[PDB]
Every structure is written in structure tokens, then in C-alpha cells.
């Protein structure tokens, strides 16, 4: 994976030149935002289980997904979906700390749609769950940090689609 600093370094390196002033300004913006990024990571790490519980409550409960014949039927499938949401939240936190979505593409989104199609996991339902998770995180950590985290949640949702 590459983070924001490494992304700028790679952008400058393919041209064989040092970081131009605009790249330095982007780097300084990332350095200035690191404090709120760490604060958001702390909050999400402290409330991960609550976040996933609220996400499932407002996105998947009492629908046909949890009924027999749904994809969250039986406790094993329910726990598997909860584990997938835990993965999504943790790697969204990783990407928010890193300042870019490379980790999401490398560890999650590469072939996740194919795996879900093979297993019969509904893509629309999990996109809805990711958007509900974005709303839950925004409610927990505030507006600005919520938007920063929603950038990567939207990246996950787009990658699934």
C-alpha cells in the first residue's frame, strides 16, 4: 500500500523530479490533517462494535436478508456479514489514516465483487450497509471527520458496484 506521502513521491518519481510546490502544499495539508485523522482513528477504534451494530440495525435487520432464504440466515452467515462489515470499517480507518484509498483497493476491493457474486452475497444490500455505516460514523465522530471517513466508505461502495 501507499499513503498520501508515498502517492506524492510516486507522482514526482515517474517524472524523475523533486516534489513541485503544489505537491509540497498537498503534503503540508496532509501533515496538518494528521491530527484530526488520528482523533478519528481513535474514536472509530473505540466504537467499532457499536458502529457495526448500528449499521446492521439500520441497514439489514428486519429485512428479507435475515429471514430464511436470505443471505444472513443462520447464525454463521450473520456472523460472516458482521465480520465483513468489521473489515470494511477497519480498512476505512486505515485508509483515512493513510490519506488515500490504495489499501482498500489492494486488500478488499480486488475481486470482492467476484467473490460475492460466486457466494450469492447481495451487492446492493452490502452497498446499503456501507452507506449506513458511513452515516453512523458521521454521527459518531462529527461532520468534518465523518466526511473524511465517508470518502473512503464511498470508495468501498463504488468498488463493490
Amino acid at each position: 500500500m501507499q499513503d498520501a506521502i508515498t502517492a506524492l513521491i510516486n507522482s514526482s518519481d515517474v517524472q524523475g523530479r523533486y516534489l513541485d510546490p503544489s505537491s509540497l502544499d498537498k503534503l503540508q495539508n496532509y501533515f496538518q490533517s494528521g491530527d484530526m485523522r488520528a482523533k478519528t482513528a481513535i474514536a472509530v477504534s473505540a466504537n467499532a462494535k457499536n458502529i457495526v451494530t448500528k449499521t446492521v440495525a439500520k441497514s439489514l435487520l428486519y429485512t428479507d436478508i435475515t429471514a430464511p432464504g436470505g443471505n444472513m440466515y443462520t447464525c454463521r452467515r450473520y456472523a460472516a456479514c458482521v465480520r465483513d462489515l468489521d473489515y470494511f470499517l477497519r480498512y476505512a480507518t486505515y485508509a483515512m489514516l493513510a490519506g488515500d484509498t490504495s489499501i482498500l483497493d489492494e486488500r478488499i476491493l480486488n475481486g470482492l465483487r467476484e467473490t460475492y457474486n460466486s457466494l450469492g452475497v447481495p451487492i446492493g444490500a452490502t452497498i446499503r450497509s456501507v452507506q449506513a455505516m458511513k452515516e453512523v460514523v458521521t454521527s459518531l465522530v462529527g461532520a468534518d471527520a465523518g466526511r473524511e471517513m465517508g470518502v473512503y466508505f464511498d470508495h468501498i461502495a463504488a468498488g463493490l458496484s
Binding site: 439500520k58 486488500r107 446492493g124 452497498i127 446499503r128 452507506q131 452515516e135 461502495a157 458496484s161
Partner: protein, 669 residues
């Protein structure tokens, strides 16, 4: 029931051993050029090749005499050589020019064992006599093959277990005949003492291996209740290529230990990458292995938990692909079932990559195959009995291009095994274009490969989501469909034209340039560049003057060189067929019926005939007639889902209490 396919890799199993093949295979599996000793072996084999050829030719020229000497030793009361059937040349095969034109008439014009009983030819039967004579000739032929190959493997793999396949009543007789043949063969040199030695050795090897009585199959016991147990005949193992197995011994010299360590690196990292990536910590590990503090098992466990392994085979991959690769790196095999993948996925979720490495190395299977001192090696075809369930994925995993595929190959196939046919083109997921406004975007086979073939038969019909577009009169039969991004009643329609000049301002629903631009935007997906409309100007005129209908204008647009260059010249043929069908018919093809029909038209007549076949189809007349520009009428499931990325309206989540005094116990003091 099982429609999913993992693909059919091209495999060429070894049927026997040759000296060059054996030497080169041993060198290949160690990833280095030929040694001096191996090159000397090859040179010695090559320098002696002329003598081997002379010996084989001598045996071939006297094949009838040798087989007769063998047969006369065991058969009585008849002529055994009457039952020896020689191979027949296939003359007059089609295309050989044997027949010119359609005229076919003018083309013509050692002491016997105690109590040995001979076999009566007449009472033995024609079938069994032919069996026996062909067996003797086959034995001699394979002996000459073994002489030429420099290796008796072609004999050993094909006569061990033969006793009993040839009836047990005549095994003794067989031996007698073979010995007789041997005697006759030795009568044909009598002056070399080296060719005689070679012939004696090959005949003795044949007799000794044929005498083995029902060799046991090598059993591959399932490692868990989710894995099946299998058996492999010894002949298959003997004929297969040999794995050079390295065993680490603390008493071995430093060079041999370093060779074993290099083998460990070549297995775990797929290549000795240790020097390239500056794996300096390796030194410490190597010491702990050389001094005997840890075993090869612990060395491999520490390698799997190293930063080098994480950088190489964890960071670039998802969890599923990383598990699939670690299976090969720590077990020498691919994953067997989806239950095995589920257990390893749970292990990785609970503890991470070190936990997964521990689960692989600490397994009973690892100690069963590699123990503590044996360097892990690649298993697979020819080493042990293989499963069909992970055939394609495992064969692709053992290739060097395995770390280049990012989409998981095992969990996807294992999941799709349990499902009906997928929602995809019958020719594969790579034949489905992106359902966008313009551009033929297809999954490239060789770039980020993730093909998932399925066994679609010729009669499968695809399920398509109707877009709900069309004029209101051409509705109410399929009006229940609705797709985002569909211009419902906004279809382009031009009523046909029917001695005075027209008024200055005559207004239709769309102006003539607007209608022509709409037709171009539908046929080509987008507006062409400035000069690109030059070849079609006359056609446009014929549309404006009523000479041709909108159907003919569309046909001429699709037949233009611009359309051919955009969607036919640089496209896989069936990909072009599917995309052109989507552009002209407004829907994907249903299945292999339409695809086969259009593919046959493209094969026999070409692109223009394909355009004519699509435009002249009765469905085109039913849907668009003569005056309507085509429009999108159906989309696939994935294309529908790509246009619906917002689900916030469905997440609305899911009053007066129904109990008085809740959460209280009865009779509280």
C-alpha cells in the same frame, strides 16, 4: 447441477523417462543451469547414441525371429505367428491426393520351470492368441524404445502391475516366453559384450518388474472430513517427473546445508528473492538452522512471519488471495474445499498473517508430508492422486504467474460450484461489455485475469432487465421494467416524406441536424468528430429526401468504415458481435442460439452480412420498424446495478410500552 468450471489447463503428463528429460527436469526444478556432472552425463549419453540406435535397429530387423522364438517356447498345436497382427498404414485419407477428383475406381489398378504346461493354440482361442502375440511384439517394441531412450522407465512403469492384468494362469508362461526372446536377442550380437549387457539388463528389468505381484496403490488420506481420500497407482508415480527432495541434516557440510536453504527459499518465496530484497535477517535464521537449534519446520514458520513474506505475498493481495497463495507456499498444494478456506479465513480474521502461517505450518498435513527436516516441495499431478474439484485452480496456482492474479481463484470457484449458471454471457464474463453510453469496454483475458467459465449449453436463455423505454403504443406488454438512465418516451422517430418549394420554417419534433445527430449518437454511442461524417453525407441526403427510411439509414451508418474501425476491426469477433447487437437491437443476445447464428454469418460472409442479418431480423422490425432509431431496451444485472449506486432510501431502519413496570421481578421485598 455442477455448471461452474475452473478451466482446463493444458497438461502434458510424463509417460516415461528419458536421460535428457530426467537430467533437464532435475536441473529445472532447482532453478539453475546444468551442473558439470549433469552435462557430462548428457555428453556420455549423446556420444553413445549411435550404438543404441544400432542395437535397436538390430532388434527391430529380427523382431519376427525373436517373437517367434518366444512364442514357440510356450505354444503347441498350431502356428502362433498366424495371430500376430502388424500395424496397418492408413492410406487414402481425405486430402491425401490418393483419389483425384470424385473418381475412386481408377485409383486401384534355458530350462523350463518345474511342472510347466504348454498352451494349446487351438483350445486357447483366437482372441487370447492374438492378445499373447501382440503382447510379445509389444514387449520387444518397448524394449527397443527403452534402449533408445537410455532408460528402462518405459518398461518399469508399464509392467509393474501387469501381472494379473495378463491372466495369472499364464504369468509363468509369459516369463518363459520372455526368457526365450532374451536368448534369441543375445544370439544377435554375440560379439560385443556391451550390447549384450544392455539387452540382458533391459530384459532382466522387464522380467523383475513384471514379477511384482499386485503393487499397492499410494493412498492420499483426506486431511479432514471435508477432504476426500484418493489412490494413485504406482505406475503413474513412476512415470511422472521426480521431485528432488532436500532433507536438512546438521551433520552435512555447509554447502549441502546452503543448498537445502536455497530450496527452502525457492519454495516459500517462489524464488530466491532473499539477496534481491536485502533480507539480511536471513543470516540469523540460517545460523539457527545450521547450528541445529531449530528445524526446517521452524525455519519455514519464521520465514512466513518475516517482513519479506508479508511484502511479497500479503501486501499486494486481498485476504482470500493471500490465503490461496499461502496454501501453496506452506503446503505445496492448493486449497481443497470452501470449508478449508473458511477455517483459514477465520484463522486470519482472529489472529492475522502470523496466525495463518502457524495454522499452515502446525497442521498435521505439514508434518505428514515434510516432517521436521524435509524442505517443503510442490505436490500435484504425478506426485499423488489429484482431486477434480480444485484441478484448474491448483494447476494455475503452481505456475509462476500465480502471484500476478489478484482476483481469488479458489473461493470463487468453490462458491460457484454450489450455484446455478451465473448471470453472464455464455462465452464467459469476458464477453460482456460495460453498459455505458459509448465504447466497447471488455475484460481483457491477459490483463488482471479473472475468467469464470461456465458450461452454458446451446439452449440457455439469458434473463434481462427491461428498461421500460419506448413509445406508449409499443408498451403495456413489457412496461413493468424500469432502469435508471433510460429516456422512456424520447425515441427518435421520423415519419416518411410524401412541385413547389417548401416553406422557410417547417418544424418537426427534431430538426434534421438534431435527428441525424441523435441517430449517430445511438448507432455509434456518441457524436463523431468533425470530418468523420463526410463519407455518409449522401446517405443523409437520401434520408432527408425520403429516398430511404430510418432503418436503411441506420444500416448504412452501421456499414460505414468508421463503425467498422470502431467496433469490428480491433475486436475479438464474438465481442464485436455482442457489442454490435447491443447497439443495433438495443439488448444483449439471449444465448448461444443467436450468438452461434451471428458467428456463423460472420464466419461465412463477414461483417456486412452480420449488419444485414441484425437489421433485417423480424425482431428489429417488431421493435423499431422502419422509422425509429434503435434504443436500449434491456440491461444486464450488473449494468443495472452500476446505475443504482444510492441506497439511502432503503435504510429507514427497523412508542407506548406493551408492559407495565418492565424489567422487574415478582414479589420484590
Amino acid at each position: 447441477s455442477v455448471k461452474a468450471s475452473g478451466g482446463s489447463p493444458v497438461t502434458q503428463p510424463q509417460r516415461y523417462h528419458t536421460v535428457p528429460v530426467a537430467v533437464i527436469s532435475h536441473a529445472v526444478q532447482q532453478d539453475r543451469c546444468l551442473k558439470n556432472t549433469e552435462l557430462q552425463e548428457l555428453a556420455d549419453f549423446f556420444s553413445s547414441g549411435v550404438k543404441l540406435l544400432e542395437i535397436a535397429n538390430t532388434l527391430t530387423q529380427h523382431a519376427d525371429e525373436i517373437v517367434l522364438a518366444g512364442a514357440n517356447r510356450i505354444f503347441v498345436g498350431g502356428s502362433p505367428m498366424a495371430y500376430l497382427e502388424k500395424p496397418k498404414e492408413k492410406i487414402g485419407l481425405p486430402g491425401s491426393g490418393y483419389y483425384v477428383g470424385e473418381d475412386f475406381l481408377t485409383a486401384a489398378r534355458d530350462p523350463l520351470p518345474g511342472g510347466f504346461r504348454f498352451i494349446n493354440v487351438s483350445r486357447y482361442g483366437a482372441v487370447r492368441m492374438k492378445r499373447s502375440m501382440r503382447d510379445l511384439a509389444w514387449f520387444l517394441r518397448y524394449i527397443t524404445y527403452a534402449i533408445v531412450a537410455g532408460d528402462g522407465s518405459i518398461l518399469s512403469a508399464n509392467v509393474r502391475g501387469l501381472r494379473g492384468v495378463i491372466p495369472e494362469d499364464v504369468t509363468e508362461a509369459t516369463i518363459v516366453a520372455l526368457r526365450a526372446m532374451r536368448r534369441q536377442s543375445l544370439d544377435y550380437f554375440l560379439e560385443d559384450a556391451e550390447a549384450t549387457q544392455l539387452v540382458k539388463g533391459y530384459f532382466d528389468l522387464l522380467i523383475a518388474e513384471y514379477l511384482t505381484d499386485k503393487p499397492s496403490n499410494q493412498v492420499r488420506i483426506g486431511v479432514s472430513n471435508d477432504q476426500q481420500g484418493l489412490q494413485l497407482p504406482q505406475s503413474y508415480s513412476m512415470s511422472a517427473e521426480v521431485r528432488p527432495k532436500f532433507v536438512f541434516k546438521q551433520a552435512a557440510t555447509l554447502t549441502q546445508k546452503q543448498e537445502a536453504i536455497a530450496a527452502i527459499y525457492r519454495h516459500v518465496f517462489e524464488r530466491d528473492v532473499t539477496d534481491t530484497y536485502g533480507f539480511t535477517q536471513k543470516a540469523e535464521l540460517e545460523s539457527q538452522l545450521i547450528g541445529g537449534n531449530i528445524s526446517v519446520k521452524e525455519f519455514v514458520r519464521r520465514l512466513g512471519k518475516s517482513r519479506l513474506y508479508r511484502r511479497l505475498f500479503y501486501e499486494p493481495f486481498t485476504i482470500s488471495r493471500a490465503i490461496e497463495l499461502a496454501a501453496r507456499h506452506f503446503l505445496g498444494r492448493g486449497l481443497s474445499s470452501r470449508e478449508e478456506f473458511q477455517t483459514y479465513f477465520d484463522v486470519m480474521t482472529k489472529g492475522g498473517l502470523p496466525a495463518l502461517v502457524d495454522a499452515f505450518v502446525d497442521s498435521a498435513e505439514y508434518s505428514d508430508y515434510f516432517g521436521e527436516e524435509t524442505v517443503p516441495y510442490l505436490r500435484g499431478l504425478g506426485q499423488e492422486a489429484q482431486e477434480c474439484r480444485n484441478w484448474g485452480p491448483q494447476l494455475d496456482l503452481f505456475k509462476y504467474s500465480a502471484p500476478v492474479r489478484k482476483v481469488p481463484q479458489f473461493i470463487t470457484l468453490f462458491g460457484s460450484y454450489q450455484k446455478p449458471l451465473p448471470e453472464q454471457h455464455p462465452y464467459g464474463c469476458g464477453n460482456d461489455p460495460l453498459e455505458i453510453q459509448f465504447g466497447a469496454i471488455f475484460p481483457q483475458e491477459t490483463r488482471n485475469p479473472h475468467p469464470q467459465p461456465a458450461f452454458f449449453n446451446k439452449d440457455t436463455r439469458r434473463i434481462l432487465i427491461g428498461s421500460g423505454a419506448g413509445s406508449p403504443d409499443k408498451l403495456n406488454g413489457n412496461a413493468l421494467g424500469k432502469v435508471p438512465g433510460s429516456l422512456g418516451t424520447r425515441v427518435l422517430k421520423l415519419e416518411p416524406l410524401h412541385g413547389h418549394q417548401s416553406p422557410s420554417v417547417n418544424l418537426l419534433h427534431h430538426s434534421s441536424p438534431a435527428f441525424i445527430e441523435g441517430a449517430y449518437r445511438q448507432v455509434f454511442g456518441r457524436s463523431l468528430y468533425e470530418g468523420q461524417r463526410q463519407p455518409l453525407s449522401s446517405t443523409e441526403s437520401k434520408l432527408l429526401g425520403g429516398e430511404i427510411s430510418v432503418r436503411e439509414f441506420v444500416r448504412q451508418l452501421a456499414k460505414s468504415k468508421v463503425f467498422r474501425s470502431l467496433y469490428w476491426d480491433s475486436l475479438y469477433v464474438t465481442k464485436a458481435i455482442e457489442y454490435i447487437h447491443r447497439r443495433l437491437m438495443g439488448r444483449p443476445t439471449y444465448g448461444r442460439q443467436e450468438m452461434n447464428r451471428y458467428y456463423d454469418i460472420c464466419a461465412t460472409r463477414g461483417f456486412y452480412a452480420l449488419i444485414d442479418a441484425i437489421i433485417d431480423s423480424p425482431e428489429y422490425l417488431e421493435c423499431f420498424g422502419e422509422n425509429t432509431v434503435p434504443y436500449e431496451r434491456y440491461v444486464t444485472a450488473r449494468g443495472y446495478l452500476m446505475r443504482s449506486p444510492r441506497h439511502e432510501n432503503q435504510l429507514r431502519r427497523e412508542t407506548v410500552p406493551d408492559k407495565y413496570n418492565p424489567r422487574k421481578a415478582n414479589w420484590a421485598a
